[PDB]
Design a protein around this ligand. Structure first.
Ligand SMILES: CCCCCCCC/C=C\CCCCCCCC(=O)O
Length: 132
């Protein structure tokens, strides 16, 4: 089930996010702001549709999707990607594909905390979110 991911989460730790952003071609100015931003992520369900909001003082995003069904997404850094989200080993796995590249955004619950692992190229970033 997806239900233990649901709720409101705030960033409390981040490792290697600059590497991840630079691997995606994000410019220095955006990387600078992003290194100091602590987003709030809200994940809600209505039937088979999940909505994931990411809010901050610089950028906001919102996506709605059905697990296992491709959707178009315009990311926070303005990539237009083809996305699919699924549950795999109890993790929420979001795969983005564009121009032959791939990145994964994988969420795992460990001791009530939401660990987001971002992988692109050789860059691996780990972000820790705490429940609200
Ligand atoms: C909507 C705010 C999320 C972060 C704000 C600024 C980041 C913009 C630059 C790179 C984004 C790369 C893809 C999105 C990263 C998601 C990180 C997260 O949810 O913690």
């Amino acid at each position: 089930m997806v239900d233990a991911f649901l709720g409101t989460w705030k960033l409390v730790d981040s490792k290697n996010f600059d590497d991840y952003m630079k691997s995606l071609g994000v410019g220095f100015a955006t990387r600078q702001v992003a290194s100091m931003t602590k987003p709030t992520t809200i994940i809600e369900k209505n039937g088979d549709i999940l909505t994931l909001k990411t809010h901050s003082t610089f950028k906001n995003t919102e996506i709605s999707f059905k697990l296992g069904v491709e959707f178009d997404e315009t990311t926070a850094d303005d990539r237009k990607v083809k996305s699919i989200v699924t549950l795999d080993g109890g993790k929420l796995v979001h795969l983005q594909k564009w121009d032959g590249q791939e990145t994964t955004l994988v969420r795992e619950l460990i001791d009530g905390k939401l660990i987001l692992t971002l992988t692109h190229g050789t860059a691996v970033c780990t972000r820790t979110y705490e429940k609200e």
